[PDB]
């Protein structure tokens, strides 16, 4: 069964005595029904909807990396509402292994 990543004792040693877990808010903000503008026509309302996607949002950490919106299933990865053609580029399921080949490295 999965019980999280394994941690070694040395990995828990801080480089400063004042380090504490970062208090970054992972609440993306306050939302409601997407509110369109009467002036926007069909094309521009589509742009408005595409700019309100929660799955395009993320939280930036203190080192510049971002933790994105993540889901257990790919149903939450398409634009909401679902467009006619969703996965133009095949989603990549990344597996990890310890195998390696010499061609990838250079000395």
């Amino acid at each position: 069964i999965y019980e999280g990543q394994t941690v070694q004792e040395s990995e828990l040693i801080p480089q400063e005595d004042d380090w504490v877990i970062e208090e970054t808010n992972f609440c993306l903000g306050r939302n409601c029904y997407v509110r369109f503008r009467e002036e926007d026509d069909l094309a521009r309302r589509a742009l408005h909807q595409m700019d309100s996607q929660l799955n395009k949002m993320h939280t930036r950490l203190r080192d510049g990396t971002v933790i994105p919106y993540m889901s257990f299933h790919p149903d939450e990865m398409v634009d909401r509402p679902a467009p006619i053609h969703t996965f133009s580029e095949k989603p990549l399921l990344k597996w990890t292994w310890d195998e390696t080949y010499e061609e990838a490295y250079d000395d």
Binding site: F36, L42, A43, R44, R45, A46, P83, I84
Partner: protein, 65 residues
């Protein structure tokens, strides 16, 4: 085109003509009538009344109404 990105773009962008919704509700209403209208028609055909009076097939008191 941007207009074609979303399926049923007019409805999803909240510009659709309301008549589409009315037809959907009307279609549902007509479907419901297929249970009520033949009931009335069949009752009249075999009894001559659209609907019975409650307990009219049983013995009733003199003052029953």
């Amino acid at each position: 085109n941007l207009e074609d990105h979303f399926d049923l773009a007019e409805y999803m962008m909240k510009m659709h003509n309301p008549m589409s919704e009315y037809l959907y509700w009307i279609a549902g209403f007509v479907s419901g009538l297929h249970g009520i209208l033949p009931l009335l028609h069949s009752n009249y055909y075999f009894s001559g009344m659209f609907l019975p009076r409650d307990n009219d097939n049983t013995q009733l008191c003199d003052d029953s109404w």
